[PDB]
């Protein structure tokens, strides 16, 4: 289950990264000063957003752009924490074997 949800989180994260990159460009174009207006760097922004690396070179300036951003943040946070939860359940189970329980 934990391994499945982890893999499910990864494939969902990828989808969100792709869709989020596409939706960002669509939302940002039309607003003067926006830098998130091309797909290649938008995808790079999506990775930055999901990981929270905080380079701060690219960010949305519109309402819907920021809404897309939030979805990517939470998706990244949920995913990277589901993996942590999956790794924990793995270690907990292995500990319950090296003690014979």
């Amino acid at each position, epitope marked *: 289950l934990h391994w499945r949800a982890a893999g499910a989180a990864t494939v969902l994260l990828v989808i969100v990264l792709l869709a989020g990159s*596409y939706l960002a460009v*669509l939302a940002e*174009r*039309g607003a*003067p*000063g*926006a830098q998130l*207006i*091309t*797909y290649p760097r938008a995808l790079w922004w999506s990775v930055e957003t999901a990981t929270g690396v905080g380079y701060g070179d690219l960010y949305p300036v519109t309402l819907w752009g920021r809404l897309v951003a939030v979805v990517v943040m939470v998706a990244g946070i949920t995913s990277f924490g589901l993996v942590t939860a999956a790794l924990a359940t793995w270690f907990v189970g292995r500990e319950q074997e090296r003690r014979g329980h």
Partner: antibody
Amino acid sequence: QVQLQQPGAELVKPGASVKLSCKASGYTFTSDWIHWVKQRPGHGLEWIGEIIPSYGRANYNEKIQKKATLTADKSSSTAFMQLSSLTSEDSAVYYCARERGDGYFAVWGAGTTVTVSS
Amino acid sequence: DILLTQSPAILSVSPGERVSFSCRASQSIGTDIHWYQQRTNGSPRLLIKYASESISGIPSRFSGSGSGTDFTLSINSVESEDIANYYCQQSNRWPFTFGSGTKLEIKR
């Protein structure tokens, strides 16, 4: 093969309107944006607006008077530009261009020479 | 909006020499600049994308350099077919904008 096909010329009466077309061919992606550029005789290039056919979303130049309205037909792969209430100031060559969503205009149309007179 | 200044407006060069077109942005745009060529009665044609990247079908004597706010289009050994107008265009911030344009002129 020619990727963007525009009619050679369009004669318009002052006050009337015209709907320019831009039939496309070649590779087609959802990331494709169709742009329109205005060039008056002896002048430079002027970005009018853009549109993404796979959504119908359109953006326009805010620094100029809005004379244009962008639409597209996904089936016939044709982009449309509605110019309304035209004066002599609107007489120019109108280009259409294709952008892969990476910032540059790879291919241009031959351009439509729009003349506004009676 | 990003302002692109192309000075001078006209360049007079002798056949075989190396010419350089200038494009200055009103603010830092990295390398998000693109160069186009337009001959008489012709449509614009992409020469250089992203400041220095080459385009297929374009003669190798065309090159580009620069970053930030200062960009240069260079033609190595100018010949008669290079006589045209040259425009730069940025894609860093919305909306996209063009330079005023620079005309190449050959003194034969």
